Design a binder for this molecule. Structure first.
Ligand code: NA
Lengths: 257, 50
């Protein structure tokens, strides 16, 4: 799979052979290359790419005048995506903070078919995450990891194949609602605790009721006692750090008009 | 028009016992109180037994 993108050569090659031998105890260090188990090399000689696949591990020789040399790490790499602003299918504004893991699958395509594989891959992960979550309600986003991952993978594989890249994971490390929505969306949790509080409060009413009845039966034998309790309530209330408005009301004067 | 059928069903059940609609009113007030700039004016009818 190739990427989508002579007599005078021997003279330059011979000149380079001679020059490097003339400079041998210095230039041999530039000629020699060592590629580790987990690396691959892409080599051009007079602009043509050396026949076959990417060069494997071991010891290799190049002439720096006529040859160009690119070295590719084949290991998995992880990148912490910058945070994004997203809209859910139900139209909720959320900000998410992603992470992507990816690996070079074909070293030749990664070098010769795309200008910058890393930037292409990292941007593609952002736009793919933006799209998929726009097809889900907020509740589905929290519950449907496996389905969401499956949807992204097919999208990513179709695009990254030509770049020689395999994306292995995309995941989310933070999700935030804007502050104006936070209590409104929490209604279900708030209601459950209020429901249990109501049961506790009603039990308190029942426990206190007997003493109030006993107090009432004494008070009603001289009914003006309730007005004395009323006036003491006003004195207690006035002491709190709040505004109190009081209206003395001469009812017998009003009774006259 | 789309919402009307469910409201009719809810109304028919609620109206079979008199206090039910009043409970719905009070729950609404509790929901209102959480929003900003919501002033509530609350009468307390009291009897001094004269
Ligand atoms: Na991130």
């Amino acid at each position: 799979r190739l990427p989508d993108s002579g007599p005078c050569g021997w003279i330059l090659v011979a000149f380079s052979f001679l020059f490097t031998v003339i400079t041998f105890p210095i230039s041999i260090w530039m000629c020699i290359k060592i590629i580790k188990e987990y690396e691959r090399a892409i080599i051009f000689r007079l602009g043509r790419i050396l026949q076959g696949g990417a060069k494997g591990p071991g010891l290799f020789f190049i002439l720096p005048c006529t040859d160009s040399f690119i070295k590719v790490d084949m290991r998995t790499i992880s990148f912490d995506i910058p945070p994004q602003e997203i809209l859910t299918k139900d139209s909720v504004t959320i900000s998410v903070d992603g992470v992507v893991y990816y690996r070079v699958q074909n070293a030749t395509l990664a070098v010769a078919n795309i200008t910058n594989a890393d930037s292409a891959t990292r941007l593609l992960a952002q736009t793919t995450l933006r799209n998929v979550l726009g097809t889900k309600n907020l509740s589905q986003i929290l519950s449907d990891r496996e389905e969401i991952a499956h949807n992204m993978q097919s999208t990513l594989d179709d695009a990254t194949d030509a770049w020689g890249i395999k994306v292995e994971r995309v995941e989310i490390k933070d999700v935030k609602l804007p502050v104006q929505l936070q209590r409104a969306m929490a209604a279900e949790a708030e209601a459950s605790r209020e429901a249990r509080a109501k049961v506790i409060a009603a039990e308190g009413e029942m426990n206190a009721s007997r003493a109030l009845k006993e107090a009432s039966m004494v008070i009603t034998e001289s009914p003006a006692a309730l007005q004395l309790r009323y006036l003491q309530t006003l004195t207690t209330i006035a002491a709190e750090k709040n505004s109190t408005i009081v209206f003395p009301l001469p009812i017998d004067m009003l009774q006259g008009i």
